[PDB]
Swiss-Prot record:
This is Lipoprotein LpqN. It is a lipid-anchor. It is found in: Cell membrane; Secreted. GO terms for biological process: cell wall organization. The lineage of its organism: Bacteria, Bacillati, Actinomycetota, Actinomycetes, Mycobacteriales. The gene is lpqN. Involved in cell envelope biogenesis. May act as a membrane fusion protein, connecting MmpL transporters with periplasmic proteins, and play a role in cell envelope lipid changes during biofilm maturation. Is also a virulence factor required for intracellular survival. Associates with CBL, a host ubiquitin ligase, and probably blocks the normal functions of CBL and disturbs CBL-mediated antibacterial activity. Interaction counteracts antibacterial defense but causes a reciprocal enhancement of antiviral defense. Keywords: Cell membrane, Cell wall biogenesis/degradation, Lipoprotein, Membrane, Palmitate, Secreted, Signal, Virulence. Disruption phenotype: Deletion mutant grows at a normal rate and has a normal cell envelope lipid profile, but shows altered lipid profiles during biofilm maturation. Mutant is attenuated in macrophages, but growth is restored when host CBL is removed. It comes from Mycobacterium tuberculosis (strain ATCC 25618 / H37Rv). Interacts with the periplasmic loop domains of the mycolate transporters MmpL3 and MmpL11. Also interacts with secreted cell envelope biosynthetic enzymes such as Ag85A. These interactions are weak and may require a putative mycobacterial adapter protein or molecule. Interacts with human ubiquitin ligase CBL.
Amino acid sequence: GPNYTIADYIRDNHIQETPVHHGDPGSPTIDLPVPDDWRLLPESSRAPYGGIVYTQPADPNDPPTIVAILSKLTGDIDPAKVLQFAPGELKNLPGFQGSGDGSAATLGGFSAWQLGGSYSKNGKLRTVAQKTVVIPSQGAVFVLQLNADALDDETMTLMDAANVIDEQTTITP
């Protein structure tokens, strides 16, 4: 894609990135709320740091989901640059249609960025949203991404939960 992404920033600055899993020593404790009619997702390929899934999907093989990804960055890291380039990933999605590059946000005292829009996948319109939180810690910068994704016709269901996830998720270093 044409837009500069967090992945590009990590590459172009020789920053080491490693995945983080629940219980890793020295990692922050991050708990997502589980709204009514949603259920916890365990850690998996599709949900690296777990997430939540909607239990009454229109398509049981394609339910609304909000997944967490937690990475650990070490090296010469500017946390503000992670947030500056957070919009690139979504803006590079096939057929992405947005309402700007998002806006600044916070979570647990840590700076963040959130944006959303629609995109096309396999001839189906989807709603997507992403909140990125930078979590500077002992000798590293952790990056949390909360990725919401659902079919267009389930936008309201998705974003009602995403608003709760984006606001009530707790971060304890």
